[PDB]
Design a protein around this nucleic acid. Structure first.
Lengths: 141, 123, 545
RNA sequence: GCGGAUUUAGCUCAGUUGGGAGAGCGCCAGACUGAAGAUCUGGAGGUCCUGUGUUCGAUCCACAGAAUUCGCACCA
RNA sequence: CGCGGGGUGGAGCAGCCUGGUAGCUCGUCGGGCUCAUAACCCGAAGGUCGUCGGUUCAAAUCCGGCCCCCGCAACCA
RNA sequence: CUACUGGAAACGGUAG
RNA sequence: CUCCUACGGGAG
RNA sequence: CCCAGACAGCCAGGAUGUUGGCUUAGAAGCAGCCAUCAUUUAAAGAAAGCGUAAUAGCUCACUGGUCGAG
RNA sequence: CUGCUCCUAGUACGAGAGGACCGGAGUGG
RNA sequence: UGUCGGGUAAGUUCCGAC
RNA sequence: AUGGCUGUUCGCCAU
C-alpha cells in the first residue's frame, strides 16, 4: 500500500540471536545495533512462539536506528517427526523410509495452514503430500 | 750396554703418540656438528649411547660423546669439543662440553653440576 | 623542546614523500644538492637497486619559520610494510606526528593505510599533504575527498605542492610546525634515550641514532644500556644535517647520533633505552623486545662450496636483523643448508634478494612449511622437526599437522580472490564479520601452507589491502599425502613429494613421466615407480636397448 | 592410443563354495636362555585400488574408471 | 616368421615312439647315536604329470590348441 | 722574501 | 693492496 | 499455428508448501543423485542459462493485452 | 632480413615482482 | 656412444679402470 | 649458427 524502503530481511531462531555468522555482519553492514536487536527480538519472540524460526524484517533509518515486524514457518521437518524418522529417503519413491497416515497429513496441513495458500483443508493436505513424495514418505489412507 | 756402543748411537726417547690429534695444544675447539646419532657400546655392555660427529674449526672433523641425560643437540647446532675418549665407543676420543655455546647442560642435575651444565639449583 | 618537531613520512610512489623527503632537505639544510631517486638518494645498496626505501637514514634539520623562530625538525623514514610491523610502530613511537604524502593524480593505497591507521591508533597528528599537483592528471579536490573517506582524516585545508618546482613544500613545513605538538619530557628528569638504530662505522665504530625522551645527554656522561646493563663513555655525539656535525650535548626532544666504544651493534639493541649511570631511570621506555617470525623455508646452496659463505652471510644479516631466524639443516639430496624464519613474504624476499646480490649466492629455496605431532602405531606422541626423521609409513597411526588461525582484514571487493586462495591452501572458514565496506575474515589454514609463501599470494591477490595475523590453534589430521618414488628399486629421496590426497595418484603419474623423459632406453631395464607406503601407485619401466 | 597381466597389512604375497579377511617378514610381548639368537604362543596392524550395480550376503560376479606393468617404432 | 627339444612329489634327472606297472639322488617328517650339533643309522610321507579336448576298455605314454622354457637357422641382390 | 708563472691535487718552474 | 682524482696523476 | 487474433516487436506479471529429500563446510530452481507432485490462477518448470561461498540478483519457459496478416 | 639501446613511460597494467601498446630517435649483425 | 675416472667450453675416437 | 665426437645424415653435448 505504501512502497519499498531501506531495510533488511532475515529468518532468525525464536529465542536466540547475536552470533556473527548468522546475524551480526548481515545487518551490521547497514549500521544496525546488533546488541539492541538481539535482545529486542528474543524479547517478544518468546511470547509469540519459541523453537520455531521466525522471519523478521528489520527496517533501519537514517538515524541508523531500526524497527521490525515479526511473522511465520516450514514442512519436510514435520513429516520427519510424524514419520518418526531422522532424515529423508535419499532415493525418493525408490525406497520408502517411512509412512504417514492421511490423518497426520491433515494435522500438518492445519499447522502450516497459516503459511499455506490452500483455500480449503483438502487443498493444503494435497500440498503436504507433495513434500512427502519428495522425501520418500508414503501416506496410508 | 757398552759405553762406546752408545757413543755411536746414544739412547733415544720413544716419541709418544698424542692420543688426541684434533688437539694442537688447544685444550678445546669449537665445532659445527656434521650430524648426531645413537650408536651401541663395545661388547661387554649394551644400551644405545649418544654420540655426534662435529666438525672442528680447523677442519679436523671428529666425533664426540654427549654425557648426561638428554640433550638439545640438533644438527647445525655448534658445540665446543672437550676431549677425553670413551671405551664402549670406538674412535670417539672427544666429548662435548655441555652448557656451552649451543649445547645446553643437563636437566635437574643436583649433583656434580660442574660437569654437563647446571648453574645452581634454585638457591 | 618547544621548538623540536619529530615526525615521519608515510608515502608510496613514488607519491612524492621521499621526494617529499628530498625536497624538505633542499629548503632546509640542503645540505647542498638535492638528490634524486634515480641518484642514490637513500644510502644503502638495497634501496638503491630497488629504487625504494627499504629503510633510510633519518634526518635532522633547522627551519626558520614565518614567526621568525628556528625549529629543529627531526624526521624518520617509515618503511611501508607490515612484515616489519613492529619496526614501523617503534619509529612512530618516536614521533608526535606524521605526514601523509598523497599523490593528487593517484589517490591513497593500502600499504600507506595500515601504517597510517596505526599512526592514528598512537596519538600522533597526521598532516594531509597533496603531492605532485603540477601533473596534468592531478585531481586535488577528489583526492581530498578520498583521504577524508578512506583514512578518516580532515583534509579540507590540505597543503599541496609540486615535485617540479618545490612550491608549497615550505607551506608543508609551516603546517607541520603549527599542528604537530613538540615533544614532551623533563630536561632535568632521569635520562631516557630511545635507540632508534645502531650500525658499524669502519672508522668510528658502533654508532647509534638516539631520540631523547627524558633528561639531557652531554659529552662526558657515562651512559647505561638498560637491557645489557653495561656502561659506556659518551665520547662523541651530534646531529645529521645530513652532514655529520658534532655537538657538546643532545638535549630533551632532540634526535642525534652517539659514539661510545660499544663492542658490536648487539650491545646497543634497537628499541633499548639509554640512561645515565649516576642517575638511572627507574623504568626503561616501553615497547623494547627482540621479536619473531611467521613464515619458514629451507635455503640450500646449489654448490656445497658456497655453504661457508652462506653461513657467514646469515651471520652478517643477523647483526642487524632481530627477527630473522635461521638454524642448520641437511638433506641427503639437497645438501647442507639452513631452515629459515621470516616475518612474512617480503621479509623473505628482501633477504633472498640480498643473499643473491650482495653475497652473490645461487640458492635453492624449498617452498615454506611447518612442524608436526605424530602418533605411532605403538601409541605415543612424538614431534617432528625434520621430514627426514618422520617414522616409517607403517609406524604412523595418525599424522597431525598444525592448524593456524588466520585473522584477515580486507575490502569487500577482494574477498572473492581471497577465500579462493584460502581454500586452495586447504583453509576452513571459522568466522566472518562486516565493518562498513571492510570484511573481517577468520580462517583456519594448515601452518605448513601458511609458511610456504602464501602471505605474498594474498598480498598480490588483494593488491596489498589484506592484512594477515596468524597464530597456532591446534594439531589435526593432515590430509595431504606423501608419495615416494623408488627407481630401479632404490629409494630416491630427492624425488619425493608431499601433495594433496585428491590428485596424489595423478601427481605420481606425472612424476613417472617426468623421469621417463630424463632417462633414455639404455643398457639395462630401468624401473621407475611412485608409491605411498607399501602401495605402488604408478610404475613405468624404461625398456633396455 | 590397442590389447593382455597386475592392484589384499608397513614389505613380499596366499586366498575357489559368494558367508572366517590370512601367511611370511616385520614390530611388541610370553614361553625358553645363565643371556641374546633360533623355535613355539600371542598381540597390535586393513579404503581387499575407486564408484555404481547384481545378490539374503561381495576380496570373489557385472559395468565404468584409475594406477602399475609388458607387448608397437634414433648408439651417445 | 620357420624348424626341434623340453614342462613328472620341494630341487635336479628317468619313465613316453614299445598305451594298463610312475623309478633315482637330494631334501621334508618320525625314531636312534652324542653332553649336544653335524655326520651315520632305522622308518615314513608327498605327485590334478602345463593347460583347454580328442581317439581308446584304459592316456605320464598316441593325435591336434594355445601358455611360458631352450637351441638352430632368417642367406643373393 | 718579492714579483711573475704550471697543476684538481701532491707538488713545482722562472727572475731578482 | 687500500684511498684520492678534474683521469693527466697522486697518497699510505 | 492462427481476424476465437499467428510470428517478430512491444508492456504486464512468473506466486505458495519449499531453502523439495539426500548429500555437503554450504547445495536455497541452477556441483552431484532421487523425486519432479500439490496448491493459487490469466499464467506460475521443485526450473533454461548467467551468477553467489551459500543466498541475493538478472534473463528464460509460461500467460494476459497492444497491434493486425501472415 | 633483423638485434639492441634511448624517448614516450618506469606511464597503462600490477598487491608486488615486474612491466607494455601506439608512435619517435639512434647504433649494430 | 656399457659404466666410472682423465683430457675438452663441448670427446660414438683416445688413455686409465670395472 | 659455429664448434666437440662420429664417415655419418641424425643425434648427444658446448656456446
Amino acid at each position: 500500500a505504501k512502497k519499498v524502503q531501506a531495510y533488511v530481511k532475515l529468518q532468525v531462531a525464536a529465542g536466540m540471536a547475536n552470533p556473527s555468522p548468522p546475524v551480526g555482519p548481515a545487518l551490521g553492514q547497514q549500521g544496525v545495533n546488533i546488541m539492541e536487536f538481539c535482545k529486542a527480538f528474543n524479547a517478544k519472540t518468546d511470547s509469540i512462539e519459541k523453537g520455531l524460526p521466525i522471519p523478521v524484517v528489520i527496517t533501519v533509518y537514517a538515524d541508523r536506528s531500526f524497527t521490525f515486524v515479526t511473522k511465520t514457518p516450514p514442512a519436510a521437518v514435520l513429516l520427519k517427526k510424524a514419520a518418526g524418522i531422522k532424515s529423508g529417503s535419499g532415493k525418493p519413491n525408490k525406497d520408502k523410509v517411512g509412512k504417514i497416515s492421511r490423518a497426520q497429513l491433515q494435522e500438518i496441513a492445519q499447522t502450516k495452514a497459516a503459511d499455506m495458500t490452500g483455500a480449503d483443508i483438502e487443498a493444503m493436505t494435497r500440498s503436504i503430500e507433495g513434500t512427502a513424495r519428495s522425501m520418500g514418505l508414503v501416506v496410508e489412507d | 750396554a757398552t759405553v762406546n756402543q752408545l757413543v755411536r748411537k746414544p739412547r733415544a726417547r720413544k716419541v709418544a703418540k698424542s692420543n688426541v690429534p684434533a688437539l694442537e695444544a688447544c685444550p678445546q675447539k669449537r665445532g659445527v656438528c656434521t650430524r648426531v646419532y645413537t650408536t651401541t657400546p663395545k661388547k661387554p655392555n649394551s644400551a644405545l649411547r649418544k654420540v655426534c660427529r662435529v666438525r672442528l674449526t680447523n677442519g679436523f672433523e671428529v666425533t664426540s660423546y654427549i654425557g648426561g641425560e638428554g640433550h638439545n643437540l640438533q644438527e647445525h647446532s655448534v658445540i665446543l669439543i672437550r676431549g677425553g675418549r670413551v671405551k664402549d665407543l670406538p674412535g670417539v676420543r672427544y666429548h662435548t662440553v655441555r652448557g656451552a655455546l649451543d649445547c645446553s647442560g643437563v636437566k635437574d642435575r643436583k649433583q656434580a653440576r660442574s660437569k654437563y651444565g647446571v648453574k645452581r639449583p634454585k638457591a | 623542546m618547544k621548538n623540536i618537531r619529530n615526525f615521519s613520512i608515510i608515502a608510496h610512489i613514488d607519491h612524492g614523500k621521499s621526494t617529499l623527503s628530498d625536497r624538505i632537505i633542499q629548503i632546509c639544510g640542503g645540505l647542498s644538492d638535492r638528490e634524486m631517486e634515480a641518484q642514490v638518494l637513500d644510502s644503502m645498496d638495497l634501496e638503491r637497486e630497488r629504487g625504494i626505501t627499504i629503510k633510510a637514514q633519518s634526518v635532522t634539520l633547522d627551519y626558520k619559520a614565518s614567526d621568525g623562530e628556528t625549529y629543529q625538525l627531526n624526521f624518520i623514514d617509515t618503511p611501508g610494510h607490515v612484515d616489519f610491523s613492529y619496526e614501523v610502530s617503534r619509529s612512530l613511537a618516536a614521533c608526535e606526528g606524521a605526514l601523509l604524502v598523497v599523490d593528487a593524480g593517484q589517490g591513497v593505497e593500502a600499504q600507506t593505510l595500515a601504517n597510517c591507521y596505526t599512526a592514528m591508533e598512537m596519538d600522533l597528528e597526521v598532516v594531509p599533504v597533496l603531492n605532485k599537483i603540477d601533473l596534468p592528471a592531478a585531481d586535488p579536490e577528489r583526492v581530498a575527498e578520498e583521504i577524508e573517506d578512506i583514512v578518516g582524516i580532515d583534509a579540507t585545508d590540505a597543503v599541496r605542492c609540486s615535485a617540479k618546482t618545490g612550491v608549497g613544500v615550505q607551506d608543508v613545513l609551516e603546517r607541520l610546525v603549527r599542528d604537530i605538538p613538540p615533544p614532551e619530557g623533563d630536561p632535568e628528569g632521569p635520562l631516557q634515550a630511545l635507540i632508534i638504530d645502531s650500525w658499524f662505522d669502519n672508522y668510528l665504530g658502533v654508532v647509534s641514532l638516539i631520540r631523547i625522551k627524558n633528561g639531557t645527554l652531554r659529552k662526558g656522561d657515562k651512559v647505561k644500556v638498560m637491557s645489557t646493563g653495561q656502561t659506556y663513555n659518551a665520547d662523541r655525539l651530534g646531529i645529521f644535517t645530513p652532514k655529520q656535525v658534532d655537538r657538546t650535548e643532545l638535549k630533551c626532544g632532540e634526535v642525534g647520533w652517539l659514539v661510545c666504544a660499544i663492542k658490536d651493534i648487539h650491545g646497543a639493541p634497537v628499541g633499548d633505552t639509554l640512561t645515565l649511570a649516576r642517575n638511572p631511570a627507574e623504568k626503561a621506555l616501553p615497547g623494547f623486545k627482540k621479536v619473531k617470525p611467521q613464515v619458514y623455508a629451507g635455503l640450500f646452496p646449489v654448490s656445497s662450496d658456497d655453504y661457508e659463505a652462506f653461513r657467514d652471510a646469515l651471520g652478517k644479516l643477523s647483526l642487524n636483523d632481530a627477527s630473522l631466524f635461521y638454524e642448520p639443516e641437511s638433506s641427503s639430496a639437497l645438501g647442507f643448508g639452513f631452515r629459515c624464519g621470516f616475518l612474512g613474504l617480503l621479509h623473505m624476499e628482501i633477504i633472498q634478494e640480498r643473499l643473491e646480490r650482495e653475497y652473490d649466492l645461487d640458492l635453492i629455496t624449498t617452498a615454506p612449511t611447518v612442524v608436526y605431532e605424530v602418533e605411532t602405531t605403538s601409541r605415543e606422541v612424538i614431534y617432528v622437526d625434520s621430514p627426514s626423521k618422520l617414522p616409517a609409513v607403517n609406524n604412523i597411526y595418525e599424522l597431525r599437522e598444525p592448524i593456524a588461525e588466520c585473522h584477515m582484514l580486507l575490502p569487500q571487493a577482494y574477498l572473492g580472490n581471497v577465500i579462493t586462495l584460502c581454500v586452495e591452501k586447504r583453509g576452513v572458514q571459522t568466522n566472518m564479520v562486516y565493518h562498513g565496506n571492510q570484511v573481517a575474515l577468520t580462517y583456519e589454514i594448515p601452518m605448513a601452507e601458511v609458511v610456504l609463501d602464501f602471505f605474498d599470494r594474498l598480498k598480490s591477490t588483494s593488491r596489498g589491502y589484506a592484512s594477515l595475523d596468524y597464530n597456532f590453534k591446534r594439531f589435526q589430521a593432515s590430509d595431504m599425502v606423501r608419495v615416494d618414488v623408488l627407481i630401479n628399486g632404490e629409494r630416491v629421496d630427492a624425488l619425493a613429494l608431499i601433495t594433496h590426497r585428491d590428485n596424489s595418484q595423478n601427481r605420481g603419474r606425472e612424476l613417472v613421466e617426468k623421469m621417463k623423459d630424463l632417462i633414455p632406453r639404455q643398457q639395462f631395464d630401468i624401473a621407475i615407480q611412485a608409491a605411498i607406503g607399501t602401495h605402488i601407485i604408478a610404475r613405468s619401466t624404461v625398456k633396455q636397448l
